[PDB]
Amino acid sequence: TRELQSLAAAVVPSAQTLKITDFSFSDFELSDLETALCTIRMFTDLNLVQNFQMKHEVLCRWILSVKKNYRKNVAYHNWRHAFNTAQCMFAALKAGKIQNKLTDLEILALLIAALSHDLDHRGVNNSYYCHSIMEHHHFDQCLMILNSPGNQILSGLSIEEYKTTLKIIKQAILATDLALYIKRRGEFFELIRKNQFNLEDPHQKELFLAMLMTACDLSAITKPWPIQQRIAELVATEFFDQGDRERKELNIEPTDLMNREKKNKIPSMQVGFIDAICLQLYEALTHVSEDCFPLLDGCRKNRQKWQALAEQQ
Amino acid sequence: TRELQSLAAAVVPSAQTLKITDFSFSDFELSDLETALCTIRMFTDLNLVQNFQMKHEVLCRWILSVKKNYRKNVAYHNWRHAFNTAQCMFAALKAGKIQNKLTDLEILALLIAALSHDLDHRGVNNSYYCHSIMEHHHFDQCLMILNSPGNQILSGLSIEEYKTTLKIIKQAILATDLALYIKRRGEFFELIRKNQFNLEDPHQKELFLAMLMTACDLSAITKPWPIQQRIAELVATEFFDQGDRERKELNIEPTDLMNREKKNKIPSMQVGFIDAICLQLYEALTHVSEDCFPLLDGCRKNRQKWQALAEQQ
Numbered sequence: 001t002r003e004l005q006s007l008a009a010a011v012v013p014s015a016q017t018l019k020i021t022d023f024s025f026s027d028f029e030l031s032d033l034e035t036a037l038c039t040i041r042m043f044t045d046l047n048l049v050q051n052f053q054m055k056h057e058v059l060c061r062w063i064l065s066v067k068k069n070y071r072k073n074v075a076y077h078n079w080r081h082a083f084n085t086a087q088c089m090f091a092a093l094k095a096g097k098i099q100n101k102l103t104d105l106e107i108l109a110l111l112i113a114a115l116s117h118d119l120d121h122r123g124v125n126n127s128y129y130c131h132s133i134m135e136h137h138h139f140d141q142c143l144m145i146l147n148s149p150g151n152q153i154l155s156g157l158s159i160e161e162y163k164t165t166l167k168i169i170k171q172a173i174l175a176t177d178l179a180l181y182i183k184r185r186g187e188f189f190e191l192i193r194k195n196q197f198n199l200e201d202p203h204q205k206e207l208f209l210a211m212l213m214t215a216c217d218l219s220a221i222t223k224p225w226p227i228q229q230r231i232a233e234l235v236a237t238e239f240f241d242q243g244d245r246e247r248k249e250l251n252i253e254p255t256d257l258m259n260r261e262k263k264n265k266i267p268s269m270q271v272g273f274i275d276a277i278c279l280q281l282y283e284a285l286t287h288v289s290e291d292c293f294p295l296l297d298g299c300r301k302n303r304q305k306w307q308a309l310a311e312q313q
Numbered sequence: 314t315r316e317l318q319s320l321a322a323a324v325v326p327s328a329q330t331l332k333i334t335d336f337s338f339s340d341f342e343l344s345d346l347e348t349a350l351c352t353i354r355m356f357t358d359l360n361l362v363q364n365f366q367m368k369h370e371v372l373c374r375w376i377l378s379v380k381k382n383y384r385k386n387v388a389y390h391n392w393r394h395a396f397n398t399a400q401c402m403f404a405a406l407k408a409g410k411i412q413n414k415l416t417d418l419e420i421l422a423l424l425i426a427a428l429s430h431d432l433d434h435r436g437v438n439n440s441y442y443c444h445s446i447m448e449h450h451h452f453d454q455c456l457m458i459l460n461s462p463g464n465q466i467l468s469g470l471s472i473e474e475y476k477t478t479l480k481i482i483k484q485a486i487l488a489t490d491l492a493l494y495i496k497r498r499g500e501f502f503e504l505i506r507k508n509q510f511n512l513e514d515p516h517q518k519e520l521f522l523a524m525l526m527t528a529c530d531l532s533a534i535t536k537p538w539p540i541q542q543r544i545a546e547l548v549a550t551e552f553f554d555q556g557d558r559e560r561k562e563l564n565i566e567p568t569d570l571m572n573r574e575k576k577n578k579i580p581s582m583q584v585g586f587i588d589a590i591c592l593q594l595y596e597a598l599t600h601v602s603e604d605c606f607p608l609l610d611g612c613r614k615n616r617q618k619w620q621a622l623a624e625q626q
């Protein structure tokens with residue numbers, strides 16, 4: 001492919017040339033091809049290619065696949081969301097002094113995983129339990145790939161390696177279903193308020209890693225007003241287009257969050273979100289590794305721009 | 314393909330040579346190949362090929378696709394479930410004097426639809442709202458096909474034809490989600506108890522056509538103790554294997570309906586079903602067209618075998 005060859009025989013800059021190491025980083029400027037070089041870098045400055053000796057040409061045949069297997073039709077749940085979640089994954093990892101808490105497996109899972117937490121989205125979301133169906137279609141799609149020929153970045157691990165990682169990847173993706181993350185967090189939100197925390201304990205390694213996956217899913221909510229707002233207008237575009245669709249085939253009305261109107265109350269809906277989900281998920285996180293404040297803060301900096309906009313309704 | 318060519322230059326028996334016209338009909342005896350000749354007959358004795366001048370070679374290129382695009386790995390939600398739901402659709406239509414109540418459009422939708430109500434199942438079901446996700450993956454897969462080249466059985470209709478039918482097909486498939494069918498039926502179950510019934514009214518044509526789709530979904534629940542039991546051990550197989558899986562990756566226990574044990578209480582689980590869902594959905598139907606009693610009865614004939622088996626626990 002005149003695509004793989006290219007990204008193959010190019011030059012993956014660096015964690016610095018690419019500034020992929022900051023909570024303030026955005027996809028906005030660089031072209032897709034580049035969001036490939038970065039990602040490739042991601043694996044690289046993460047030790048994934050070297051330990052698991054990933055074939056250069058396949059990390060790229062994978063990614064490209066991973067990418068092209070995304071729709072630029074949806075207005076948020078597009079490749080640029082996965083990239084921006086792998087990034088925010090790749091940063092709370094380094095500049096967050098979090099990496100030092102995970103194994104080299106759980107780190108391959110989270111990169112591979114995180115670049116697939118929403119693999120084949122179509123624009124069908126919620127607002128409040130479904131047992132994570134949309135999520136198995138993502139994993140089943142995740143796996144569909146990793147197994148694919150010429151895109152097998154795990155074809156270097158061992159039976160108990162490929163297992164232990166598919167157990168994280170899966171359990172990982174399936175954790176982007178806020179439902180679970182809400183029918184859980186409530187507890188992982190006391191290991192803190194009782195400090196009895198501990199990552200050596202498996203279960204807690206679960207609750208953590210999860211609360212971490214969503215933390216990055218919502219990555220864009222703690223981004224510089226520019227980068228952040230520029231995105232909420234995208235998720236908005238989608239949330240509204242989903243109402244429009246479900247008022248054509250079906251004949252239901254919209255749940256505010258999704259009606260092309262109520263656009264004036266979008267703030268308090270953004271505000272409510274943060275207070276209902278964002279805030280505590282990030283502050284609490286912080287306590288794990290204080291090098292995460294950049295998020296919990298960017299958040300509070302945004303939940304004061306909404307409280308502003310909203311104080312005009 | 315040595316397949317299509319074959320099913321192409323063969324001989325589609327008849328509604329009688331194939332006995333595809335009775336609630337007591339089963340897939341069990343005939344090979345897949347045949348489950349295609351039947352299905353092909355289904356379109357044929359249904360006027361779909363003649364009105365919509367469907368290319369012989371394509372109904373078959375379609376069908377085969379539709380088929381092959383199913384997994385013989387699942388132990389129920391396999392091609393033989395769709396066939397058996399198209400069938401039960403094809404008979405409550407004829408032998409049920411129901412056909413005389415639908416347009417020629419809503420009849421293509423239902424055949425085309427019905428042979429796709431669960432297009433890409435993997436063995437992930439429920440027991441009690443998800444907004445019909447698995448169902449859009451089915452439709453999106455349903456459509457994926459119909460559009461496919463050489464398998465376009467609608468490439469004979471008109472813009473407002475192909476539309477009107479996708480509105481039915483879609484709304485149709487998406488109605489196999491008992492959830493909706495339960496968050497509805499309750500009313501379509503009063504146009505009867507108040508007789509204020511009426512199919513000329515669109516909305517009611519919905520509720521009807523839906524209640525009818527699930528009617529055929531559960532088709533096998535009203536089948537001769539042999540044909541029926543032979544299947545419940547299959548659906549059982551699946552419901553249990555889904556529990557085994559979700560006690561492997563995940564570490565949850567089983568919801569009875571899905572644990573490899575509790576196999577002794579399978580009757581009262583089969584019993585409660587019928588009473589919670591089957592019974593009413595079939596008796597009430599009957600009133601629409603009394604020629605459907607063969608189902609409401611076969612059901613009652615089964616909900617007395619379970620009451621027997623169960624009266625031994």
Ligand SMILES: CN1CC(=O)N2[C@H](c3ccc4c(c3)OCO4)c3[nH]c4ccccc4c3C[C@@H]2C1=O
Pocket residue numbers: 125126127128218220221228231232235236237239240257266269270273
């Ligand atoms: C289920 N659910 C609940 C919810 O309320 N939201 C927020 C939100 C709030 C109001 C809105 C909205 C999104 O779109 C249109 O009006 C919200 N704000 C963002 C900023 C950046 C990236 C994603 C989001 C989301 C997504 C997130 C979500 O997925």
Ligand SMILES: CN1CC(=O)N2[C@H](c3ccc4c(c3)OCO4)c3[nH]c4ccccc4c3C[C@@H]2C1=O
Pocket residue numbers: 439440441531533534544545548549550552553570571579580582583585586
């Ligand atoms: C939520 N829910 C409740 C329930 O209790 N059931 C039944 C049932 C009862 C006992 C079982 C069972 C299914 O599988 C193993 O043991 C049952 N019996 C069938 C026969 C044929 C096709 C589908 C079913 C189902 C599916 C249906 C369902 O979807």
Ligand SMILES: [Mg+2]
Pocket residue numbers: 117118176177217
């Ligand atoms: Mg999600």
Ligand SMILES: [Mg+2]
Pocket residue numbers: 431489490
């Ligand atoms: Mg179903």
Ligand SMILES: [Zn+2]
Pocket residue numbers: 081085117118176217218
């Ligand atoms: Zn996401």
Ligand SMILES: [Zn+2]
Pocket residue numbers: 394398430431489530
């Ligand atoms: Zn079905």
